[PDB]
């Protein structure tokens, strides 16, 4: 469905290697940043900038922010993930800690829980999907369902520096 459009715009990756491949990880990391850059540029070019991100010096730890807009209002959540040893075969697990307890589609630790459709698709495309594809096909669709829902259940509330 829609997927196809976002997928198409993101560059595929090639190196099948994870953090403990002495020789090939740095080549996978090069591919990770390149795709990421291109996704962000794409996101800026359309007026659709929905996140910020940073890594540790080895690209094994990642941390940042995302935001969702609902009824003209912005909700902003901190996020982070560690690259597994079995990456890129195994997909990394994104954590939004601030919603821990507050949403059913999430494990303890803030570890979000995706649809059943994600894993099979990740797996049939190994090693072409990377972090850009994670953001695009995992977190974002997760926000597009959970955030509206938590808002209408009063589980979350917009936050201005302020008072009526």
């Amino acid at each position: 469905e829609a997927t196809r459009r976002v997928v198409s715009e993101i560059p595929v990756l090639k190196t099948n290697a994870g953090p403990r491949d002495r020789e090939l990880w740095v080549q996978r990391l090069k591919e990770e940043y390149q795709s990421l850059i291109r996704y962000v540029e794409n996101n800026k070019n359309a007026d659709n900038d929905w996140f910020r991100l940073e890594s540790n010096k080895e690209g094994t730890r990642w941390f940042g922010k995302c935001w969702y807009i609902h009824d003209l209002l912005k909700y902003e959540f901190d996020i982070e993930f560690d690259i597994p040893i079995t990456y890129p075969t195994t997909a990394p697990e994104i954590a939004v800690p601030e919603l821990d307890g507050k949403t059913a589609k999430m494990y303890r630790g803030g570890k979000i829980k995706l649809t059943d459709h994600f894993k099979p698709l990740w797996a049939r495309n190994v090693p072409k999907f990377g972090l850009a594809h994670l953001m695009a096909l995992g977190l974002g669709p997760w926000l597009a369902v959970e955030i509206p829902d938590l808002i209408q259940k009063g589980v979350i509330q917009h936050k201005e520096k302020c008072n009526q």
Binding site: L72, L73, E160, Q164
Partner: protein, 102 residues
Amino acid sequence: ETMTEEQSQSFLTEFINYIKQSKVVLLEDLASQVGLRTQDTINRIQDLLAEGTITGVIDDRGKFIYITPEELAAVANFIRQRGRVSIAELAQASNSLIAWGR
């Protein structure tokens, strides 16, 4: 609490001034300059647009854009040039069809 008819009206003055100086207004900055919730600033501005007192659009992210009549004209021509055009080819075109500044 809710705004005296007097206070309501310094709202509109502030707003006009921002539009006159910037053309595009971020509603969280308007809200802050007037000391209102973005929520209520937006809702107020929705009523003004309904009254016809104000002319413009609020994008999905809550930025306000005043569109000039020469712009409205250009949009009309652009649709007529194209004959058939998708709403998304429009949204794309808006970057060039509209000024984002004074």
